[PDB]
Write a protein that binds this ligand. Structure first.
Ligand code: HA6
Ligand code: CO
Ligand code: ZN
Length: 330
């Protein structure tokens, strides 16, 4: 078995190897990358997503989200308070203001310490989940807007044609903006490219140990757990590395910098935070190996979790037994 300790692996494809996306994902998994739940891919030195990021200030963040925390420093939930629309230019200026700017710090490790000590006492604003792409249409390799769709993958593997499309999303971040512990919808893969700005720190639990995290979450968020059997789908719960370590939960951490890809693998729980103003792009994707994860993925039926148009068909085909009750919630 490759990568038995489930370490986060870092890959350095040549431009040649970077020319077939599906093939390279398969290669990474042949080396055991998926066992970590997360991998980093550093693109070839001659590759670029686009020429410059000089013309992005007019992108609109229609619904910026203020992330308000409740709980203890190492164990908290966050809710999203909707704010008035602003452009990326306006958002960037806000992120860089005295109220929201990254504080002085010695290194990544010091900043991480400051995050977990101080996160709950501030409410940063996140420009998350914006439909769109910053890849140049002429960028041919690893263009997140030109990937094969999950619908076409499902059709290729299971012989069923389904409705739906899947497109990329943009994430404009600032210091302390946070993504809560979760797996992807239907336990899909995700691929995330950090286009510009300050880093993004990730935490991840190996897929083979996901149920250990769930068990701890039920204990740490007893109210949320009773309300919904798959409450992490709400994407609201944070647990610090210190608390994970205290409770024996296997996990790993890594910091993503501008110009780098991160891939999350099926049923790899992850969470993290942004160091300062940045912009990332992400999309879900599937491979043949995902299919069996899709069939087993837990669903929120309490109504809280966000439901996309495309999800209907994946539940309908892969989880016909769940389909009725899942549809009632949504
Ligand atoms: O970088 C990420 N940002 C992000 O934004 C959020 C949307 N809702 N709450 C946070 N979500 C992510 C989810 N999985 C991986 C990376 C991210
Ligand atoms: Co994710
Ligand atoms: Zn729920």
């Amino acid at each position: 078995a490759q990568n038995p300790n489930c370490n986060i692996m870092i890959f350095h494809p040549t431009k040649e190897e970077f020319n077939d996306f599906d093939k390279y994902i398969a290669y990474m998994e042949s080396q055991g990358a998926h066992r970590a739940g997360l991998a980093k891919i550093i693109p070839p030195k001659e590759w670029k997503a686009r020429e410059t990021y000089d013309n992005i200030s007019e992108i609109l963040i229609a619904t910026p989200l203020q992330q308000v925390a409740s709980g203890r420093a190492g164990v908290f939930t966050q809710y999203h308070k909707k704010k008035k629309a602003m452009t990326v230019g306006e958002y960037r200026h806000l992120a860089n203001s005295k109220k929201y700017q990254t504080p002085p710090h010695q290194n990544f490790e010091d900043l991480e310490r400051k995050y977990w000590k101080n996160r709950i006492y501030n409410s940063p604003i996140y420009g998350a989940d914006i439909s769109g792409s910053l890849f140049d249409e002429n960028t041919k390799q690893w263009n997140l807007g030109h990937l094969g769709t999950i619908q076409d993958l499902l059709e290729k593997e299971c012989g069923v044609v389904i409705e739906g499309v899947n497109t990329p999303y943009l994430y404009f971040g600032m210091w302390k903006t946070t993504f809560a512990w979760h797996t992807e919808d239907m336990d899909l893969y995700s691929i995330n490219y950090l286009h510009l700005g300050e880093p993004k720190t990730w935490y991840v639990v190996p897929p083979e140990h996901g149920q250990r995290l769930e068990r701890l979450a039920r204990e740490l968020f007893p109210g949320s757990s009773r309300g919904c059997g798959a409450f992490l789908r709400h994407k609201v719960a944070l647990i610090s590395p210190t608390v994970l370590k205290e409770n024996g939960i296997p996990f790993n951490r890594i910091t993503q910098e501008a110009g780098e890809f991160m891939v999350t693998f099926p049923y790899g729980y992850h969470a993290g935070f942004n160091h300062g103003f940045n912009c990332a792009e992400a999309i879900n994707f599937a491979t043949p190996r995902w299919i069996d994860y899709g069939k087993m993925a837990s669903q929120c039926s309490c109504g809280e979790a966000r439901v996309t148009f495309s999800m209907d068909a994946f539940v309908r085909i892969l989880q016909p037994e769940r389909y009725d009750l899942w549809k009632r919630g949504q």
